[PDB]
Short mmCIF file of C-alpha atoms in Angstrom, two decimals:
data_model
loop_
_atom_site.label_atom_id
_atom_site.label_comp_id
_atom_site.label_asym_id
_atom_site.label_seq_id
_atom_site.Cartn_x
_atom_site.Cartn_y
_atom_site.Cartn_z
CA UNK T 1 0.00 0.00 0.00
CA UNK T 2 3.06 1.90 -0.51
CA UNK T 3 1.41 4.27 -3.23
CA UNK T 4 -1.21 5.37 -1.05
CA UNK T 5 -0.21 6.66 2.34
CA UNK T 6 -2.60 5.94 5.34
CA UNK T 7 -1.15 9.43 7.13
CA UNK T 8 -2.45 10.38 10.58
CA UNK T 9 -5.82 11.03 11.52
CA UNK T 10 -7.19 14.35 9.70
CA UNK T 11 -7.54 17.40 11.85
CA UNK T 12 -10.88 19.28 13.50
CA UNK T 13 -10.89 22.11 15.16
CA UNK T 14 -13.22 23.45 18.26
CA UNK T 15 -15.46 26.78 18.10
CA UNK T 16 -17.47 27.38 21.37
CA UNK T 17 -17.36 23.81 21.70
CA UNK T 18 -18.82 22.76 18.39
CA UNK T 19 -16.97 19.99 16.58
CA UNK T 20 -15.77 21.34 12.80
CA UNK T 21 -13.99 20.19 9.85
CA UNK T 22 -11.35 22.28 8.19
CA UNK T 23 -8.51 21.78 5.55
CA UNK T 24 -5.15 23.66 5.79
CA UNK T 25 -4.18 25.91 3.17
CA UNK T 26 -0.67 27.84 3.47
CA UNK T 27 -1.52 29.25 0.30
CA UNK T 28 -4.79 31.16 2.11
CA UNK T 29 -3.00 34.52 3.36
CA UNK T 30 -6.60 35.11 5.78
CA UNK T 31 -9.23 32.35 7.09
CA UNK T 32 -12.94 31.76 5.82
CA UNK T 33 -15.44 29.86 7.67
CA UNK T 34 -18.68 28.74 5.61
CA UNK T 35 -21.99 30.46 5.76
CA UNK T 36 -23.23 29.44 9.24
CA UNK T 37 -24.97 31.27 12.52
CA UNK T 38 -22.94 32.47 15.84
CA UNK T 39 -23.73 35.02 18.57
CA UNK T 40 -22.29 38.43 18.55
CA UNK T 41 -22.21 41.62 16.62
CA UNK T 42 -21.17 40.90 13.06
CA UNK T 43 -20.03 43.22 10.01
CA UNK T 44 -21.33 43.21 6.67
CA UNK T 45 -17.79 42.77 3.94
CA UNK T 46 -18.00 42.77 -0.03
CA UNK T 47 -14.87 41.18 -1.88
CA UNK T 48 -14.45 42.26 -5.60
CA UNK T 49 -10.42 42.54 -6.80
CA UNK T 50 -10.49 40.02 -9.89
CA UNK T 51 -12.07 37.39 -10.21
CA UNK T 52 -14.06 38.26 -7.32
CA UNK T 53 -17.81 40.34 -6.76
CA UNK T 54 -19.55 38.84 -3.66
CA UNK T 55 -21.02 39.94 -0.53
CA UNK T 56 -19.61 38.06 2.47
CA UNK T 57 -19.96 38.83 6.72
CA UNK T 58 -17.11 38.59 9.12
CA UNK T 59 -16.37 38.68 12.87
CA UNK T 60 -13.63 40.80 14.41
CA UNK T 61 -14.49 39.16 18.01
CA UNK T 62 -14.11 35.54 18.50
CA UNK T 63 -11.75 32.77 19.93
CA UNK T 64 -10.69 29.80 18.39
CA UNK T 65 -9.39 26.89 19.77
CA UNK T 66 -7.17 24.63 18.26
CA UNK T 67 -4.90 21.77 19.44
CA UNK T 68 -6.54 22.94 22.99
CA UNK T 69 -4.76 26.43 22.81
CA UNK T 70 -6.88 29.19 22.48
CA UNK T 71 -6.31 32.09 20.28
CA UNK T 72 -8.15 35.38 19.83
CA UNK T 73 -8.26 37.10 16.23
CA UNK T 74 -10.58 37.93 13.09
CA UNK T 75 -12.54 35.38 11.69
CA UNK T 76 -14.09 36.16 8.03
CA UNK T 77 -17.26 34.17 7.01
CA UNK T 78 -18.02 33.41 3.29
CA UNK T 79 -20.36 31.03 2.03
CA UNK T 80 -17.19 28.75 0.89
CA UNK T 81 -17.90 24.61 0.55
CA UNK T 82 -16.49 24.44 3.92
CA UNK T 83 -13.99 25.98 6.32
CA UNK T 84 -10.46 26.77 5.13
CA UNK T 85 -7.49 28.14 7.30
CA UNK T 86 -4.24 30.61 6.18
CA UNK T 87 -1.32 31.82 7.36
CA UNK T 88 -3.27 33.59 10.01
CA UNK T 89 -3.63 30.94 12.17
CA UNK T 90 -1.05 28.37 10.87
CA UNK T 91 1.72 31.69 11.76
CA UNK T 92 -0.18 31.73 15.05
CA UNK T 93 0.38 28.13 16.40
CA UNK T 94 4.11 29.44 15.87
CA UNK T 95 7.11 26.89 15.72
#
């Protein structure tokens, strides 16, 4: 079965307890979380550039936990697939 590799266990991260599923992307400079609810004040964003002409919301105020270490930053919410994280967070686990 050397051509396919079994690899570790995928990875999930926890948001106010709720189980999730993400995929890592180094090539994501920022963090976007599919279309869902949470509690909280949230801000309406629009995203244009190239390529690009949508309406998306974000939070400014929420934790994250990951690997059971917290961590406190922006969190921008599209309706993407799913959830996909950058260099934001990867950066923030640090070495």
């Amino acid at each position: 079965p050397q051509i396919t590799l079994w690899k570790r266990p995928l990875v999930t991260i926890k948001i106010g307890g709720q189980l999730k599923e993400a995929l890592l992307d180094t090539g994501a400079d920022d963090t976007v979380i599919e279309e869902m609810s949470l509690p909280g004040r949230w801000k309406p964003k629009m995203i244009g550039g190239i390529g690009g002409f949508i309406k998306v919301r974000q939070y400014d105020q929420i934790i994250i936990e990951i690997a059971g270490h917290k961590a406190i930053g922006t969190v921008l919410v599209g309706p993407t697939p799913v959830n996909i994280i950058g260099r934001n967070l990867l950066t923030q686990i640090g070495a």
